[PDB]
């Protein structure tokens, strides 16, 4: 059996510090949001290993560095009073991070973080994770976990200032772009399941015109 090396932290704080020291985390705010959201409540096993871990339904909770990259990409869009959509909420981790990131920038009664997941088992599982973490997040009514097909976003709370997609979109996610507010940003892996995909960024400007930028090569493979 081929053996390999992989980073690990002694605890949540030590895991984030390690990432910041090595340049993975650029901003202090991103580091703080992740520091206050302990992976132990969201990852059943190896919580502090910088690697993807299974959570059920044939899916995994992203590796810590991938969560960091996503937070950095949307650091200027995560502000008090905004509406954020997290398509494919899974474990609920990234969702809790968004809530804390903004909560630090100050509170606003209109802030709304919506996580949409289509697997019922994960919807119940994630809610339980969030209540084990901090029962007040769900109780605030500012964080939401809904059951549905994320490909059609969630119109009740549209338009969104920022949208993050954790699952692959076979092509241009038209309906999601339609739910973006002017000046909003959307992060999503584009391409058929099984190949060289691209994590892509879509920015809509004040005139409603859309611009696409490729951020990095990515590949969905068996763990
Ligand atoms: N059409 C769709 N609508 C909603 N969720 C979807 C979906 N297609 C895939 N998913 C969900 O995409 C998620 C990808 S894994 C997401 C992991 C989560 N960000 C974490 O850190 O744990 C899974 O939970 C999967 O069930």
CATH 3.40.50.11540 assigned to 1-223: no
Question: What are phi and psi for residue 97, nearest 5 degrees?
Answer: -65, -40
Q: Where do the structural domains in the chain lie, given as residue ranges?
A: 1-223
User: What is d(CA 158, CA 164) in angstroms, rounded to the nearest whole number?
Assistant: 14
**170: Cα within 13 Å, side-chain hemisphere:** 1
**135: Cα within 13 Å, side-chain hemisphere:** 0
Tokens of 3: 């053996």
Residue stretches of the annotated binding site for S-adenosyl-L-homocysteine: 59-62, 67, 91, 117-118, 149-150
Contact call for residues 94 and 67 (beta carbons, < 8 A): yes
Number of Cβ within 10 Å of residue 36's Cβ equals 19
Query: Does the N-terminal peptide bond of residue 159 adopt cis geometry, omega within 30 degrees of 0?
Result: yes
Best CA proximity match to 110, nearest among 164, 49, 46, 157: 157
Q: Which atom of ligand 1 is nearest to the CA of 90?
A: 24
User: What is d(CA 165, CA 215) in angstroms, rounded to the nearest whole number?
Assistant: 14
Tokens of 40: 């132990």
User: What is d(CA 3, CA 5) in angstroms, rounded to the nearest whole number?
Assistant: 7
Q: Is the CB of 205 within 6 Å of ligand 1?
A: no
H/E run at residue 123: helix 120-140
Tokens of 223: 């763990």
Tokens of 72: 């950095």
């Amino acid at each position: 059996i081929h053996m390999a090396w992989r980073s690990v932290g002694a605890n949540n704080e030590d895991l984030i510090r390690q990432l910041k020291d090595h340049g993975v985390i650029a901003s202090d705010a991103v580091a703080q949001a992740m520091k206050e959201t302990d992976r132990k409540h969201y990852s059943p096993r190896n919580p502090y290993m910088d690697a993807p871990q299974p959570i059920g339904g044939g899916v995994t909770i992203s590796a810590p560095h991938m969560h960091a990259f996503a937070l950095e990409y949307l650091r200027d869009h995560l502000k008090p009073g905004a509406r954020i959509l997290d398509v494919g909420s899974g474990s609920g981790y990234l969702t809790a991070c968004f809530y804390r990131y903004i909560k630090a920038k100050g509170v606003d009664a209109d802030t709304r973080i919506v996580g949409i997941e289509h697997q019922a088992e994960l919807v119940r599982r994630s809610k339980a994770n969030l209540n084990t973490d901090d029962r007040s997040m769900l109780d605030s009514g500012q964080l939401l976990i809904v059951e549905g097909d994320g490909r059609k976003g969630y119109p009740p709370n549209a338009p969104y200032n920022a949208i993050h997609v954790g699952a692959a979109a076979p092509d241009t996610p038209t309906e999601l772009i339609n739910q973006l507010a002017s000046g909003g940003r959307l992060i999503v892996p584009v391409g058929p399941d099984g190949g060289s995909q691209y994590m892509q960024q879509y920015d809509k400007d004040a005139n409603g015109k859309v611009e696409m930028t490729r951020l990095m090569g990515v590949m969905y493979v068996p763990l």
